[PDB]
Amino acid sequence: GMTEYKLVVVGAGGVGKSALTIQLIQNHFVDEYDPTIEDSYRKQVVIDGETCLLDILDTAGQEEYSAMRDQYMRTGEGFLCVFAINNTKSFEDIHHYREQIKRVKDSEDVPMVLVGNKSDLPSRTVDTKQAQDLARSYGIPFIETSAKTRQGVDDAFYTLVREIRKHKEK
Ligand SMILES: Nc1nc2c(ncn2[C@@H]2O[C@H](COP(=O)(O)OP(=O)(O)O)[C@@H](O)[C@H]2O)c(=O)[nH]1
Ligand SMILES: OC1CCN(C(=S)c2c[nH]c3ccccc23)CC1
Ligand SMILES: [Mg+2]
After folding, report:
1. Over the Cα atoms of the chain, what is R_g?
2. Is residue 71 in contact with ligand 2, taking CB distance under 6 Å?
3. Which residues, other chains included, contact 10 with Cβ-Cβ below 8 Å and sequence gap of 6+?
4. 144: Cβ–Cβ under 8 A, 6 or more apart, which residues?
5. Facing residues of 58 across strands?
6. Residues with CB under 6 A from ligand 1
7. CATH no. for residue 65?
8. Residue 111 Cα, ligand 2 centroid: separation in angstroms?
9. Are 125 and 158 spatial neighbours (Cβ–Cβ below 8 Å)?
């Protein structure tokens, strides 16, 4: 089989995890999607000349059992850490997602991309510079997206695969 990348989208409720995932997989923006549904999706894509399979988990936070959270975190190879630019709390939560994923995987070297979503909205509480400072501290890429206009979406997910490939080659 062609190579498959297991990607996990994490972040506070309401930040756009579902909207981003459906934009990438189905190329449309969804106004409402039950905030409690946690599904995964497959899409074949070409990234820098490589035909590959993306397997993306759109997380919904708590699980029936905490062992399930641990299971997706060990299985997933890269993590999109999403906040919304209009939700300071979602940005603060990023510290906790960072910590947890590293701690389940028992690794200092986990492919992640920091994503500030809803960039189309006028309302902003999190400035670009503050998110840049965070990403610099983590040594990972940062991208601002709009699930609504699709701006930065393929960049966010393809950048994550690129981080995974850097990780593999060590
Ligand atoms: N304007 C705008 N709204 C968005 C964007 N992403 C998500 N939303 C909306 O924000 C709400 C939460 O999105 P959702 O994908 O359910 O968030 P999730 O809880 O992280 O899965 C929904 O009403 C979406 O339509 C975006 O980039 N721009
Ligand atoms: O029930 C939880 C979510 C689905 N689970 C996994 S491991 C995944 C299901 N699809 C995925 C795509 C990327 C990374 C992980 C997954 C098991 C734990
Ligand atoms: Mg959702």
Report:
1. 15
2. yes
3. 17, 59, 79, 80, 81, 82, 97, 101
4. 85, 115, 116, 117, 119, 128, 131, 151, 152
5. 9, 39
6. 11, 13-19, 31-33, 35, 117-118, 120-121, 146-148
7. 3.40.50.300
8. 17
9. no
Residue whose token pair is 């906040």 = 83
Structural domain range at position 92: 1-170
Identity at 35, one-letter amino acid code: P
Distance separating alpha carbons of residues 81 and 84, to the nearest angstrom: 10
Q: Confirm if 22 and 28 have CB atoms less than 8 A apart.
A: yes
Please identify, by atom number, the ligand 2 atom nearest to the C-alpha of residue 56.
Answer: 12
Number of domains, the chain: 1
Determination technique for this PDB entry?
Answer: X-ray
How far from the centroid of its chain's Cα atoms is residue 84's Cα?
12
Resolution given for this structure, in angstroms: 1.7
